[PDB]
Design a protein around this ligand. Structure first.
Ligand SMILES: NC(=O)c1ccc[n+]([C@@H]2O[C@H](COP(=O)([O-])OP(=O)(O)OC[C@H]3O[C@@H](n4cnc5c(N)ncnc54)[C@H](O)[C@@H]3O)[C@@H](O)[C@H]2O)c1
Ligand SMILES: NC(=O)c1ccc[n+]([C@@H]2O[C@H](COP(=O)([O-])OP(=O)(O)OC[C@H]3O[C@@H](n4cnc5c(N)ncnc54)[C@H](O)[C@@H]3O)[C@@H](O)[C@H]2O)c1
Ligand SMILES: [Zn+2]
Ligand SMILES: [Zn+2]
Ligand SMILES: [Zn+2]
Ligand SMILES: [Zn+2]
Lengths: 379, 379
């Protein structure tokens, strides 16, 4: 190819400082080293995770950085010893790695591979503990091991899911975050049985995928809870059967739910990242067997609380990370399901913009009057 | 019989008011009404649950009352419509009912039958919403639906486990509380797999039964944690393989455990009823799959807390109520395990005294070195 083994110069949205507009820059992208993959990022979506770090409220935040973690693209080059992917392969770079060999991958009880976490957590690559991005010979931090706000990114091979090349890249970029998180919270983490009564707190992309997962599981009732009643109508198509706006009830939300379900739900899913709501989601579960799954990522430092009698009396408290899906092994299977029209993906995208419109997409996300916004990186 | 249909006059340890010595009184015990069983209580054990109410720390505490909830005896008479038990049957009255036909009993996902809780919780019988005990025509409240500190008690038939008549009643009185709670926390709630690594917080009767359950489950390591190192030696016989005294380490106990178990335990069991230790028990669990079971009953109003990242990263928080055992269906099965020498019971009894020694027995329990104290009711 033209770029193989060479430093690439491309466009990237750089966050020089927290809480300031992103700046589209020309960046240098170093070639991939051993166990690395350089990806042409065709489309990137954005989510609250990108905004949390950009805001300056993330203690793990490192500036200047290239944000972004939901993307689909094409392998431009591979580093030494890469064999699962080759140039030209269609891929989804994932924030959750799957080395297949560690304690976690070989456990059979989790998807939390820790192989590259010490490097990705500090915005660098494992091979040399340095970033592959630079502006004027000065490094720019990676983010979540993905950095999808760059036209070309360098990621660890263990994070690269190889997907069907016929799959639309402007759609499947969602399968690296929200959609599998929501579906897997139901299918892998909770393991929702047919006939279950489900409560979904937060009717955004994540809560809507939980609703779709619970509908595929054959839940008898899917109760949708949101503080914005305008989000109720779009929710019906994702499987939500009933709605509650907590602002319309003086009594605690858990009490409303308990009153409507003869003691509480079989499964609840908190899809917001609000510690108060996480307690309510636990407490709205039925005595004896009710299970609350935390999906929402709460701001660092915040605590969840309840009275232990809640768990002594049969309620279970758990959480999910990427819906318990193993990235390399299972993300391709989700793309296959989507192609066979077995799962929805397109319905979670409300807007399509271009890389130059990054700030406008973040403002729209900040308004909260959209679902996923997909950006075309090469307009 | 001599007493069938008649009011019995017998000895009972009465708690007239909180935090005062119990008085051995002559009480009138009314005959059983519909769905009731009058039991000759041959032996009663004492536990922290009797002391919590006695001390006046229980806001649900009603005085004057007949305390006691761990006993074994013989059916003296039955009320109309009672068919599972007959006069002369050997029985264990249980604080947890099993009606076999409610939402909970049928569900197949819990042992928390709610049939008689409304009446037992207020120290009365369901049939007429009054007590069967009186002194000078004045009522004395029941306790836990059991009131085992009386030579004769009246209990709901749904709380009566029928047991093998050869089982020694001075030993099996323990199978109505502590021992099944510990064993079941492992076998039923956690469902501990062979080779697991277990942490047990609190090495009293309950923690020791957890250790025995975990050892029977094939746990590879059983780490016992107690603030009193004198409790370590006796714990080895119960299956505890290693010990930690939190007072001997400046680092939080969960860190000490993580450091000894390559990331944390597979299962932890809190057997104290201390909210701060409950948090440590959750946090000492391994990322991805570690499960913590709350066994200890905390003081009313106390809250448990953690950071939600602990659950999002794969730890599970649950609790147990009577070890998930169904009283009428499974307590006889535990009596059978004891008679097969499959489970220990004798080993948790450090003292045998008489009903007249009740206050001496509570004093011993307050000192907190003893395990179970068994009282001979008819001496
Ligand atoms: N665990 C994981 O692996 C993982 C992965 C991806 C995303 N997430 C988390 O999922 C959450 C949701 O993401 P999203 O993209 O769907 O967000 P979103 O902004 O589209 O949706 C959140 C919804 O919650 C609603 N809401 C806010 N406060 C509320 C309250 N008090 N009660 C009820 N509803 C309320 C909002 O109106 C909105 O509809 C975030 O917290 C994100 O961190 C977790
Ligand atoms: N969930 C149920 O169904 C159920 C049923 C019966 C009993 N229980 C609970 O079991 C608990 C234990 O009962 P028990 O009879 O074994 O009590 P116990 O007094 O015999 O044992 C408690 C132990 O905890 C230890 N301890 C106290 N503080 C400690 C700390 N900070 N760290 C470590 N160890 C500490 C004490 O030294 C003691 O050895 C009680 O809280 C009781 O409510 C629960
Ligand atoms: Zn995302
Ligand atoms: Zn791995
Ligand atoms: Zn007890
Ligand atoms: Zn029942």
């Amino acid at each position: 190819s033209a770029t193989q083994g060479q430093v690439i110069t491309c466009k990237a949205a750089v966050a020089w400082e927290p809480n300031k507009p992103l700046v589209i820059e020309d960046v240098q992208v170093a070639p991939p080293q051993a166990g690395e993959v350089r990806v042409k990022v065709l489309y990137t979506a954005l989510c609250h995770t990108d905004a949390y770090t950009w805001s300056g409220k993330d203690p793990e935040g490192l500036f200047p950085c290239v944000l972004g973690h939901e993307a689909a693209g094409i392998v431009e080059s591979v580093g030494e010893g890469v064999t699962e992917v080759q140039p030209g392969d269609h891929v989804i770079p994932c924030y959750q790695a799957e080395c297949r060999e560690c304690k976690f991958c070989k456990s059979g009880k989790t998807n939390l591979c820790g192989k590259v976490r010490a490097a990705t957590g500090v915005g660098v690559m494992m091979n040399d503990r340095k970033s592959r991005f630079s502006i004027n010979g000065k490094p720019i931090y990676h983010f979540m091991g993905t950095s999808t706000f760059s036209q070309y990114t360098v990621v660890h091979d263990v994070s690269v899911a190889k997907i069907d090349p016929v799959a639309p890249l402007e759609k499947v970029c969602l399968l690296g975050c929200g959609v599998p998180t929501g579906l897997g919270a139901v299918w892998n983490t909770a393991k929702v049985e047919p006939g279950s009564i489900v409560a979904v707190f937060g009717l955004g992309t994540v809560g809507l995928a939980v609703a779709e997962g619970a509908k595929a599981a054959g839940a008898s009732r899917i109760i949708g809870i949101d503080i914005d009643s305008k989000k109720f109508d779009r929710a019906k198509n994702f499987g939500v059967t009933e709605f509650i706006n907590p602002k319309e009830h003086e009594q605690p939300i858990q009490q409303v739910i308990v009153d409507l379900t003869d003691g509480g739900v079989d499964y609840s899913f908190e899809c917001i990242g609000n510690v108060s709501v996480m307690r309510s989601a636990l407490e709205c579960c039925h005595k004896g067997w009710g299970t609350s799954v935390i999906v929402g990522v709460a701001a660092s430092g915040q605590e969840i609380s309840t009275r232990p009698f809640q768990l002594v009396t049969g309620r279970v408290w758990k959480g999910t990370a990427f819906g318990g899906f193993k990235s390399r092994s299972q993300v391709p299977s989700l793309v296959d399901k989507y192609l066979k029209k077995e799962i929805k993906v397109d319905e979670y995208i409300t807007h399509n913009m271009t890389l130059a419109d990054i700030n406008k997409a973040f403002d729209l996300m900040h308004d909260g009057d959209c679902l996923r916004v997909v950006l075309d990186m090469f307009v």
